[PDB]
Point group: C3
Chain length 130, copies 3
Amino acid sequence: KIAFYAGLKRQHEGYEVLKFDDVVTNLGNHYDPTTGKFTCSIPGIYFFTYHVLMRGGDGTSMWADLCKNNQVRASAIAQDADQNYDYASNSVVLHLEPGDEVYIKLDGGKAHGGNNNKYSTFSGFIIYAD
Amino acid sequence: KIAFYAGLKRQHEGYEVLKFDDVVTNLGNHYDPTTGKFTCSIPGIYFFTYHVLMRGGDGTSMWADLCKNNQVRASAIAQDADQNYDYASNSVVLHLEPGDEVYIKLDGGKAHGGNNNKYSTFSGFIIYAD
Amino acid sequence: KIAFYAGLKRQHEGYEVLKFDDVVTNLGNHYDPTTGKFTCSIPGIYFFTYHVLMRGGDGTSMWADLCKNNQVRASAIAQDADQNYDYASNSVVLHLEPGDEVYIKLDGGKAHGGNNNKYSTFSGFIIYAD
């Protein structure tokens, strides 16, 4: 059984892997909140989704991408000229090999740092094992 | 087999459980459109997702949270200074026990009341049984 | 095994089926990038999700709906008075019969044409077989 769901506890900005550290579900401990990475243990087909809230009242654009190893597999942007809250969100279905790392990367701009309110999230689960 | 998908038929505002009453899928009848609640029947791991459209032309912020019993498990905001339509959406993976109730709560602001167009939605399914 | 994920390679506008032609996953080849349609091969219960990015700097509203055959099953709008990027996104769980076609239709407005960056996406997988 492989599934996880975590939220962002702190605010972040710039270009970095987002460490979702408010962990709600983590079957098999394949998601690591100290790195923000899900590491594949079984070859197969996996679903992932993310929702990253842009900071409000400070900035107009924010990008958040889902990556596999060093490669973008989905991109998203939040943008609002009046500096309103808005989301960069996307979903994927990927084939993974053992060792592959899946994570969300901030690619410019500012992310809201909810404490335990889980505004910004990352989840995933295996659909098929090879 | 446990899975459901429903849309909002009427417009709502304030602080209340959203009753998605345009039911498209409801395997096992574990979602109740008269309460807006999914009730767990089997201990296990469940995926849920929601997309709630803020009313356009009347208001600037709207919040919608996914709850388990009396506890927030995901939060979302829609915000636009020019009163444009925008979405409060999120997704989760949760462990549930029989009797647990999962639902979307409006937490301030105004939600669009599509009739049968299914702009605002709530869906879920079991991933694993314990 | 039935699952797929694809992104939009080109920009589109108006009223047309969106052809997600940047195919990442397509188990069983049930998604056709030349038509934009997923065709059901097995009766059962299926999850789909989509995220369509509105073009920035040219227009204020865009609609994108998920359809089954000739019927809307989910609707979404992106809207921003300052012509900012924003998303029309939704998710569904549907019962399908063999031959049923599921696709995303642009229903007015302008969609961003990312090349291989996968800003705009469509994915799905079977949950249950009848």
